[PDB]
Amino acid sequence: PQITLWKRPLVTVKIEGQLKEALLDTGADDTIFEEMNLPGRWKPIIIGGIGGFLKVRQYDQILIEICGHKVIGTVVVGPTPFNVIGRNLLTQIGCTLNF
């Protein structure tokens, strides 16, 4: 699919059997989701953004099904205004910017 940017590039994803909308964020190095349970041992980490830094939990090799594709990679969990699909998963689907 080709996605314009006139509106927020939100996509429906399936992660750990839960349905969520996430933002295709080329400005996000990593993927972060709002609170939820995930499989595996997680290490507490901290991420930094525009308005400050955020303490969160890091999970490795998490399966997300995004708009019909599948990817496995690091997913961070913590308070975010949006679920964000960072570049760690965008590359796996071969996502690119064009103009």
Ligand X SMILES: CC(C)CN(C[C@@H](O)[C@H](Cc1ccccc1)NC(=O)O[C@H]1CO[C@H]2OCC[C@H]21)S(=O)(=O)c1ccc(N)cc1
Query: In the complex, which residues of this chain contact a copy of itself (CB under 8 A)?
Result: 1-6, 8-9, 23-29, 32, 47-54, 69, 80-82, 84, 87, 90-91, 93-99
d(CA 79, CA 23): 15
Residue 25 annotated among the catalytic residues of the structure: yes
Closest CB to a copy of itself among residues 18, 26? 26
Q: Which residue has the tokens 């679920």?
A: 83
| Contact call for residue 75 and ligand X (CB under 6 A) | no
Report CA-CA distances (Å) from 11 to 3, 19, 74. 10, 11, 18
What is the footprint of ligand X within residues 30-59 (CB under 6 A)? 30, 32, 47, 49-50
